[PDB]
Amino acid sequence: SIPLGVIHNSALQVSDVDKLVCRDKLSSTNQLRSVGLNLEGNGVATDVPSATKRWGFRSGVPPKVVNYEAGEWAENCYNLEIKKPDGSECLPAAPDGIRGFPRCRYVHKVSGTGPCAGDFAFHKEGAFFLYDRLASTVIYRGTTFAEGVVAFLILPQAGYYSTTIRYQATGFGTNETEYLFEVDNLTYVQLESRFTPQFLLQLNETIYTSGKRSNTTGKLIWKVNPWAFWEXXXXX
C-alpha cells in the first residue's frame, strides 16, 4: 500500500506491488530513502493568515510520528505559542528528541490566543508537520516546523541564514483570526495576507529608522494602504 518511488525509463514511477521486476536490484538498505518535501514547493500560500487556516484542533485522535532522512530547505517555517484566553497552553511541549526543522529562511513565530477546541492541532489537508527528521501529525508548542509530505525511494544502484518574524494573534484557529506583525513590544502593523517576509522586514527597518515606533507606554498599531518565492493609524 505505501508507495515506493523507482526510476524506470528515465522517469520516476510508483513501484507495482503486484509486478516483479527482476532487473531492479536492491543491494543494501542504503539504497532506500525516506524523504520530506515541502508544501511550499507545490505553490501553496505561505503567509501566516493563509497557512494557519490549514491547521485545526481535534480530540480523540492519538498523534503519530514517522521518521524521514532528508529534507528540503524551507523558505517558510512556523513556530507557535498559542494559549486559551484563560492562560492554559493549547499545544503540547515537544517530546524528547523532536527538534525544530533545521533549514528555514524565515521562521514565523506566532504568539497569541484562540479557543483551541481540541486536544491536538492537525493539518486539515492531511499533510505532516516536518520537524528535524521526524514528521508528526500534530503541532508541538514553540517548535519550528515546515508543512510537508513524505516519500519513499529506492535509489539506483550506481551558507545558512534564518530570520525570525514575530506575530501576535487573537482568535487563532477560527474563521475570524486577527494578526499583528510585531515591530517591538509596543509597535505593531496590521497583518494582511499579501505581505511577504521581505516586505515585513523592510517595513520593520523603515519604522525603526523613521521614528515610527511607540514613544508612549501604550500600544501603537499601524495600517498600510499599498508568483512563487523561487521565481490604529495609517502610512504609505
Partner: protein, 127 residues
C-alpha cells in the same frame, strides 16, 4: 504506475539537507564530546529537474500521504522507524519467499552463463 504532477506549481530545483552516511570524520570529530552540535550535523546538496525527477518526487510525496496516514492510524507505535526495513524485507520475500522455479517469471535466477557451460560440455562429449 506513472507519476502525473497535478500541483498548482512545481519548484523544479531541490535544495536539500540530510546527514552524511557514513562520515569518516577528520581527527576526533566523531567523538560526541568534541563533535558538532545538533545544528551542525547536516550536509546539503542541490538537484535539478533532470528527467522530471523533482516535480515527479513532489507528486509522489503528495500521493504517498493517504496510504502513509492510514498506516500510522493503525500502528500503536508512537514513532515509526521501521518502514524502510520492512520494505526491504518485503522486497526479498517477493522474490525468495517461495520456491524459485527457474525460467519462471517470479524467479530471479539467471541460468544463462551456466547453460553455455553445459552446452560447451555437451558439444565436447559429442565430438
Amino acid at each position: 504506475e506513472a507519476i502525473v504532477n497535478a500541483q498548482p506549481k512545481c519548484n523544479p530545483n531541490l535544495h536539500y539537507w540530510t546527514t552524511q552516511d557514513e562520515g569518516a570524520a577528520i581527527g576526533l570529530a566523531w567523538i560526541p564530546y568534541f563533535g558538532p552540535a545538533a545544528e551542525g550535523i547536516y550536509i546539503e546538496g542541490l538537484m535539478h529537474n533532470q528527467d522530471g525527477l523533482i516535480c515527479g518526487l513532489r507528486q509522489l510525496a503528495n500521493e504517498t500521504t493517504q496510504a502513509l496516514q492510514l498506516f500510522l492510524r493503525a500502528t500503536t507505535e508512537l514513532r515509526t522507524f521501521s518502514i524502510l526495513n520492512r520494505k526491504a524485507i518485503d522486497f526479498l520475500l517477493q522474490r525468495w519467499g517461495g520456491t524459485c522455479h527457474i525460467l519462471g517469471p517470479d524467479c530471479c535466477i539467471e541460468p544463462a552463463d551456466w547453460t553455455k557451460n553445459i552446452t560447451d560440455k555437451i558439444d565436447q562429449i559429442i565430438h
